[PDB]
């Protein structure tokens, strides 16, 4: 039993809710919140900009030190950093950005990072400003992640389409 509430169960291990991941994170304090990161951990907009704003820019300060030490992530890769006031940990995961021409096949590799964590609060990778089809992203999530994932979908309209079209 865990503290996530109001989710629709899609599969044995995947759950979905119309929610703001920032507000969902501040209420659950999950062990892991997933950020929709880029390779530079520049949290300017989308999910990343919202998560970072909610940390009063502490996520960005920590991220800049990470990059100065380690260099950029790989597309499809991840790193574990602090969750600040939102979660114990933040798993920064880089899905491919279609608006940069990145290979959508890397979306599966991105979701594989979730399997290193027993339970996660997450957005749909490569959705939103990353330019992928959220229905495809949901399919890859369900077919790749084996750990328990609670997906927060900000837009009520897209949420309804994702549920209604789910196979
Ligand atoms: C709406 N999108 C896609 C567009 C932005 C992006 O591409 O990051 C989200 O990712 C998302 N999901 C869950 N809660 C969220 N709160 C703010 C954005 C957000």
Curated annotation (Swiss-Prot):
It is found in: Host endoplasmic reticulum membrane. It is a multi-pass membrane protein. It catalyses: Thiol-dependent hydrolysis of ester, thioester, amide, peptide and isopeptide bonds formed by the C-terminal Gly of ubiquitin (a 76-residue protein attached to proteins as an intracellular targeting signal). Responsible for the cleavages located at the N-terminus of the replicase polyprotein. Participates together with nsp4 in the assembly of virally-induced cytoplasmic double-membrane vesicles necessary for viral replication. Antagonizes innate immune induction of type I interferon by blocking the phosphorylation, dimerization and subsequent nuclear translocation of host IRF3. Also prevents host NF-kappa-B signaling. In addition, PL-PRO possesses a deubiquitinating/deISGylating activity and processes both 'Lys-48'- and 'Lys-63'-linked polyubiquitin chains from cellular substrates. Inhibited in vitro by GRL-0617. Changing residue 164 to L: In strain: Gamma/P.1. May form homohexamers. Interacts with N protein. Residues 1-167 form the Macro domain. This is Papain-like protease nsp3.
